[PDB]
Write a protein that binds this ligand. Structure first.
Ligand SMILES: *[C@@H]1O[C@H](CO)[C@@H](O[C@@H]2O[C@H](CO)[C@@H](O)[C@H](O)[C@H]2NC(C)=O)[C@H](O)[C@H]1NC(C)=O
Ligand SMILES: [Ca+2]
Ligand SMILES: [Ca+2]
Ligand SMILES: [Zn+2]
Length: 388
């Protein structure tokens, strides 16, 4: 089986070129491949982890929406950034969306988002949790433009991703091809399933918890696209291609310079809406990640190496600690509790080997030892534990 796609690590069409990749699944995470659920084999963008289609109606059903009928298993379709009519590259759009989401399924699986952790699969093959909940992957969704979204029911009911056309450019830009946005949306399914465990999807409804909900997706997309040359001095934005602005969709770049990005926990008292709040959260995680990378290095490959169950590099270690923290934090968590869950995740995973790297990043942006949450009147702190 082949896919002609912008491969994993190329965020969007302005940053790379398409090529044909063969059998891109990781069999540890997709034992049936992406094209089977163990009982049925498919000749389209359908299998254990997801089903992809266009949804021009904007409706809530999916099985009978259009997807390419390709018994060749060569999911190689025409695409050009000059094309004005997005339906003429719907096959490519669907295939790219299927590719990116399945790759991310596989990576998250390796970081611990398995069947027993409440992940999204039709068949869990005796490994725990509840199946029948592959992701419904809607490309060119007619419910709107200039946005994307993800609905996460409890374990056993499929997640639903809606990817829309964006119309701040001519030609319009199809966000199926903006991997970071795909990753951001899928991460809503990750954080909603893990937080409060897989049966509770009401744990990140709004306010500060919902803000972290936005931040986690931006962080995961950012971390995945860190480049060989990058250092803590690199600044990163979100969605700059599909949105057609070099600033991306958030108010500041993800940066370790407090000049480039000034947000601290106190700033959240003045921020309005979950995306603004999440911009602060993703900046804190960015700080922590660079502390871990500066300590452990970074692995530019598409999957981590593990030493005694622990990612060997700071990039995937950061991702793993963030994922693990979601399983330890309370339902409806605030950022102080989510900080503590990440520290506790490191205690469990590494016996506390990264305590001070984590605290330094949180403290630097006001989530130090003295921080206190309030919906309107948070208290910030830049103080560190004595051990640090
Ligand atoms: C359904 O798809 C699976 C996965 O591609 C097929 O399993 C492969 O079978 C061949 C031999 O038939 C083996 O050499 C491969 O190692 C198998 N792959 C995996 C991942 O197990 C299976 O044959 C297909 N079923 C039908 C009826 O065509
Ligand atoms: Ca499941
Ligand atoms: Ca949950
Ligand atoms: Zn979001």
């Amino acid at each position: 089986a082949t896919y002609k796609v912008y491969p994993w690590g190329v965020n969007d069409p302005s940053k790379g070129s398409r090529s044909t990749v063969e059998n891109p699944w990781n069999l540890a995470a997709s034992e049936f491949t992406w094209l089977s659920d163990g009982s049925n084999n498919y000749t389209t963008t359908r299998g254990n982890n997801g089903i992809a289609q266009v949804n021009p109606s904007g409706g809530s059903t999916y099985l009978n929406n259009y997807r390419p009928d390709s018994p060749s298993l060569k999911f190689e379709y025409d695409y050009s950034t000059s094309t004005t009519t997005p339906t003429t590259y719907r096959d490519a759009s669907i295939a790219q969306l299927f590719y990116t989401a399945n790759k991310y399924h596989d990576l998250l699986y390796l970081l611990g988002f398995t069947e027993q952790a409440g992940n999204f699969q039709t068949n869990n093959n005796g490994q725990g949790g509840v199946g029948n909940d592959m992701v419904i992957l809607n490309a060119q969704d007619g419910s709107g433009t200039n946005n994307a979204n993800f609905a996460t029911p409890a374990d056993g009911q499929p997640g639903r991703m809606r990817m829309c056309l964006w119309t701040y450019s001519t030609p319009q830009r199809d966000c199926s091809f903006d991997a970071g946005v795909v990753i951001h949306e899928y991460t809503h399914g990750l954080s909603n399933r893990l937080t409060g465990g897989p049966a509770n999807s009401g744990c990140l409804p709004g306010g500060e918890s919902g803000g972290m909900g936005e931040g986690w997706g931006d962080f995961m997309a950012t971390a995945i696209h860190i480049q060989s040359k990058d250092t803590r001095a690199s600044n990163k934005v979100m969605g700059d291609w599909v949105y057609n602005n070099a600033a991306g969709i958030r108010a500041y770049p993800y940066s370790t310079s407090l000049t480039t990005n000034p947000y601290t926990y106190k700033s959240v008292n003045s921020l309005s809406g979950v995306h603004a709040i999440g911009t602060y959260w993703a900046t804190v995680l960015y700080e922590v990640m660079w502390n871990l990378i500066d300590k452990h290095g970074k692995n530019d490959a598409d999957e981590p190496k593990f030493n005694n169950g622990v990612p060997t590099d700071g990039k995937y270690l950061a991702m793993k600690l963030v994922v693990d923290g979601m399983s330890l934090q309370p339902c409806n968590p605030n950022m102080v509790q989510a900080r503590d869950a990440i520290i506790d995740a490191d205690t469990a995973l590494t016996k506390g080997a990264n305590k001070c790297e984590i605290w330094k990043g949180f403290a630097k942006r006001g989530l130090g030892t003295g921080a206190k949450y309030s919906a309107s009147s948070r208290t910030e702190s830049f103080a560190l534990p004595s051990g640090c």
